Structure formats: structure tokens, C-alpha cells
Ligand binder design. Structure first.
Ligand SMILES: [Zn+2]
Ligand SMILES: [Zn+2]
Length: 58
DNA sequence: TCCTTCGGACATTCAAATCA
DNA sequence: GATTTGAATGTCCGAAGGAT
């Protein structure tokens, strides 16, 4: 029954953290961009459209 | 040793589907 | 209308190999 627990996620990951698959944080610039001395950039998330059927549930 | 890369486990998003 | 479902979507651990 290995379902490991994680610490709270960053609310949103900046572009560099998304690309690196590394942990972001909630301040801007994030810690990883502070360390790299690079610009910390937020990108838009995909928004689910309405009208897409799923089929019956259980 | 530090840094970069990344497969896939852990977690979130939210309209559809279902309930009441 | 209110609550539940669950695939799409998002986050980032931990391992491997490269860089310094
Ligand atoms: Zn970040
Ligand atoms: Zn950043």
C-alpha cells in the first residue's frame, strides 16, 4: 500500500519549474529562479471548455 | 559534489453526471 | 439546485548521467 505523501504543492509553478519538473513556491521570483538568477514567468493554464461529454459514471 | 533532465507517482481542476 | 465523479491537467520526487 505505497501511496507516499507530499508536502503542499505550490499553488502555481513558474515556467522554469514546469520545464525542469522542480518544486516552485508561492513568492515571485521563486527560489529556483532566484538561485539561477533568471526571470520568473507565470504561464496560463488550460481551461476546460463546456460541452464535452464524458459518458455515464459508476 | 552540483546541475540538468525526465518517467511517472502524487495531486488538483471542475463541467459532466448524478442525486435529491 | 446541490453533491459526486473521474479524465484532463498540473506539480515535482527521486534516479541517472553530465558538468565543474
Ligand atoms: Zn518556480
Ligand atoms: Zn520561477
Amino acid at each position: 500500500g505505497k501511496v507516499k505523501k507530499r508536502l503542499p504543492q505550490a499553488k502555481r509553478a513558474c515556467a522554469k519549474c514546469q520545464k525542469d519538473n522542480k518544486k516552485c513556491d508561492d513568492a515571485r521570483p521563486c527560489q529556483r529562479c532566484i538561485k539561477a538568477k533568471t526571470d520568473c514567468i507565470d504561464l496560463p493554464r488550460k481551461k476546460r471548455p463546456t460541452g464535452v461529454r464524458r459518458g455515464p459514471y459508476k
